[PDB]
Amino acid sequence: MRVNITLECTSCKERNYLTNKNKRNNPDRLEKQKYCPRERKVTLHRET
Amino acid sequence: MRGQKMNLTFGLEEVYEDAEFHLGDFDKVGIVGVNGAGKTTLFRLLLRELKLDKGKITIGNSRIGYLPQEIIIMDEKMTVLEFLAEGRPIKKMETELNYIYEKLTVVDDDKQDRLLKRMGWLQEQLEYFDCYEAESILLDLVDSMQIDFDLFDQPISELSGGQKSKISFAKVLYSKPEILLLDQPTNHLDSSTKEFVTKYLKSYRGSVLIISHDIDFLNQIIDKIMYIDKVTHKI
Amino acid sequence: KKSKKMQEALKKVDATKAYSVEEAVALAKDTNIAKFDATVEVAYKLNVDPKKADQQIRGAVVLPNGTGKTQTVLVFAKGEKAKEAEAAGADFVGDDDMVAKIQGGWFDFDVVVATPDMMATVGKLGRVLGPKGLMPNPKTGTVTMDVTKAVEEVKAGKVTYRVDKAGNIHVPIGKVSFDNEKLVENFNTINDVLLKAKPSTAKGQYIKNISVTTTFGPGIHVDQAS
RNA sequence: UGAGUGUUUGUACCACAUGUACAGGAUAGGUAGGAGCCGAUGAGACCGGAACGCUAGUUUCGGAGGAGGCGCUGGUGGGA
Numbered sequence: 001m002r003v004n005i006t007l008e009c010t011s012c013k014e015r016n017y018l019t020n021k022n023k024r025n026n027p028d029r030l031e032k033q034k035y036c037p038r039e040r041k042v043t044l045h046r047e048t
Numbered sequence: 049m050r051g052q053k054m055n056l057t058f059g060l061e062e063v064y065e066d067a068e069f070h071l072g073d074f075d076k077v078g079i080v081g082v083n084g085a086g087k088t089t090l091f092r093l094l095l096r097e098l099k100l101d102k103g104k105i106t107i108g109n110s111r112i113g114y115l116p117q118e119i120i121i122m123d124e125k126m127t128v129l130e131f132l133a134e135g136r137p138i139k140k141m142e143t144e145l146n147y148i149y150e151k152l153t154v155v156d157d158d159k160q161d162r163l164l165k166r167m168g169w170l171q172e173q174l175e176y177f178d179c180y181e182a183e184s185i186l187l188d189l190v191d192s193m194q195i196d197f198d199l200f201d202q203p204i205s206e207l208s209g210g211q212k213s214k215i216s217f218a219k220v221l222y223s224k225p226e227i228l229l230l231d232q233p234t235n236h237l238d239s240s241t242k243e244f245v246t247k248y249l250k251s252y253r254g255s256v257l258i259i260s261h262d263i264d265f266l267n268q269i270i271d272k273i274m275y276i277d278k279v280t281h282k283i
Numbered sequence: 284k285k286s287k288k289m290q291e292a293l294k295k296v297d298a299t300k301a302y303s304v305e306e307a308v309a310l311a312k313d314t315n316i317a318k319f320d321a322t323v324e325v326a327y328k329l330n331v332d333p334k335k336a337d338q339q340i341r342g343a344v345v346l347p348n349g350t351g352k353t354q355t356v357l358v359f360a361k362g363e364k365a366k367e368a369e370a371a372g373a374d375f376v377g378d379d380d381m382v383a384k385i386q387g388g389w390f391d392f393d394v395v396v397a398t399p400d401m402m403a404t405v406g407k408l409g410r411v412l413g414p415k416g417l418m419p420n421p422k423t424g425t426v427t428m429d430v431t432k433a434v435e436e437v438k439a440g441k442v443t444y445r446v447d448k449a450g451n452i453h454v455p456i457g458k459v460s461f462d463n464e465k466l467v468e469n470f471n472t473i474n475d476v477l478l479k480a481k482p483s484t485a486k487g488q489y490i491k492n493i494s495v496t497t498t499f500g501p502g503i504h505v506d507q508a509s
Numbered sequence: 510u511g512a513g514u515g516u517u518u519g520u521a522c523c524a525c526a527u528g529u530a531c532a533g534g535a536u537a538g539g540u541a542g543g544a545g546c547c548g549a550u551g552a553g554a555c556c557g558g559a560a561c562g563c564u565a566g567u568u569u570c571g572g573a574g575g576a577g578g579c580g581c582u583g584g585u586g587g588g589a
């Protein structure tokens with residue numbers, strides 16, 4: 001089951017990115033180091 | 049206790065889907081469901097250990113007495129008395145209070161306001177949990193389940209499964225709670241010990257939620273039965 | 284069942300009728316039939332439930348006219364703080380070493396007041412004072428850097444007010460010997476301090492019932508507005 | 510669109526009764542006052558009945574009798 005997901009910056013809680021993932025292949029919340037435009041630096045974003 | 053639009057999904061397998069429940073006060077609720085239904089998970093939500101993915105779970109401000117389904121032995125060398133004593137926050141507050149006194153000597157006129165406020169609450173809180181409990185607990189074992197004092201000085205990890213269940217149940221009572229969340233309170237008890245637990249829960253005036261796979265045990269106590277469905281993911 | 288004196292006092296009193304403040308103090312002075320200088324105490328039943336941490340109240344209020352009884356002071360102080368205690372005239376001046384003798388000795392001192400630095404050493408004795416309740420409490424102001432204010436307040440008649448678990452907080456306003464006006468003034472001071480002490484989380488009417496009574500006399504309901 | 514009866518109730522007054530763990534003299538509900546209090550307006554102690562009861566005892570009514578007991582104090586307990 002592949003679903004659209006939102007990656008939110010952990011630092012400022014800003015829903016910066018939209019992506020998608022297969023729940024079965026990745027049961028746990030995804031986490032990626034992405035650039036947060038609000039904070040203007042690379043931060044850890046975790047699916048919401 | 050109330051929950052609305054409850055949602056919870058560990059990975060791909062979901063537990064609650066738009067589940068709801070309202071429990072009135074002073075209700076001896078018997079929680080029933082197959083293994084994995086999510087009975088233990090409900091308590092974790094009540095204890096705020098878990099958070100619903102979506103929805104609101106509402107709990108009263110009253111103090112909650114929680115009896116875990118599995119015994120929590122932080123260290124192997126912990127003694128039964130240490131384990132039981134940890135039920136009450138007397139020791140924890142005293143350690144904080146002792147440190148507050150240390151800061152008072154070090155700090156003259158800087159942090160006194162914060163320290164003085166913290167000290168006052170600890171004393172008031174300590175008195176609220178009257179420090180006479182040291183004697184009450186010693187006799188709570190006797191009147192509760194005929195727990196011998198030789199066990200009182202023995203490491204908890206060395207006790208038998210039935211003995212551990214008695215200690216854990218006594219620990220819950222030692223905390224003097226307002227709401228009872230019992231997760232299989234008679235898992236290992238023998239016939240004689242189960243008798244005491246039943247009588248106390250019948251007499252217990254407050255609200256008590258019981259997760260049990262013992263039908264006869266529940267029937268003697270339960271007035272309201274909450275069923276956690278495994279297929280509909282509802283309550 | 285009831286003594287004739289108490290029955291006579293009862294016929295003077297009217298349970299249904301909640302007297303004004305002046306009426307209540309006068310009626311208490313009348314009701315204390317027994318021939319000794321009995322104390323006058325007022326009981327407030329606050330709506331708050333002390334079982335809640337915030338709700339419970341514990342403080343100390345200075346009474347301008349005093350309690351009608353002198354109060355022995357024990358001061359735990361060292362060096363300059365001991366000098367402050369000497370100036371104030373503490374009934375006992377001691378230090379971390381004098382606490383050991385104080386344990387079992389010089390008991391019945393009305394209130395203990397220890398310096399912050401001293402509290403760390405004083406706490407050991409305080410655990411003994413704990414059950415006695417004598418241990419200084421910062422919320423009441425007993426624990427203080429300077430003891431001069433504490434000692435003068437004790438002499439002035441500082442009263443420690445602590446709500447009971449059931450929500451009824453009692454406090455002696457003054458002796459029957461005091462003039463009814465001074466008792467009423469002390470009662471008014473008690474009323475104001477309770478209002479200021481009303482916790483934020485409290486809702487509804489703050490006080491369920493106010494009663495005044497002497498050590499011997501019966502209880503007399505008193506109007507809160509008065 | 511109003512009267513009553515009765516039953517069943519949820520609530521608030523008002524009376525009543527209960528408070529027995531360890532130790533402690535022993536049946537210790539909390540808080541505050543409390544050295545003095547109470548009894549020919551019939552005390553102590555005795556006896557029966559009734560109640561409660563943890564089985565220890567306690568609550569209370571009564572028969573007689575007529576003047577006493579109780580508390581502080583003392584130890585215990587966290588608490589008298």
Ligand SMILES: Nc1ncnc2c1ncn2[C@@H]1O[C@H](COP(=O)(O)OP(=O)(O)OP(=O)(O)O)[C@@H](O)[C@H]1O
Pocket residue numbers: 058059063081082083084085086087088089090117
């Ligand atoms: N962190 C987790 N990761 C993956 N699955 C989980 C996690 N936590 C719980 N689950 C699942 O939640 C499901 C139900 O939760 P819960 O443990 O409360 O069931 P239960 O009814 O209390 O079990 P039992 O009655 O046998 O004691 C479990 O079967 C478990 O598989």
Ligand SMILES: Nc1ncnc2c1ncn2[C@@H]1O[C@H](COP(=O)(O)OP(=O)(O)OP(=O)(O)O)[C@@H](O)[C@H]1O
Pocket residue numbers: 206207208209210211212236238
């Ligand atoms: N490793 C151990 N070290 C010290 N004492 C132990 C040890 N194991 C058991 N004991 C003691 O042996 C006694 C009985 O042993 P056992 O484990 O067989 O109890 P049991 O018969 O299984 O009781 P139940 O299963 O109902 O809890 C217990 O008092 C237990 O505390």
Ligand SMILES: [Mg+2]
Pocket residue numbers: 084087088089117
């Ligand atoms: Mg479970």
Ligand SMILES: [Zn+2]
Pocket residue numbers: 009010011012013014036037038039043
């Ligand atoms: Zn960000």
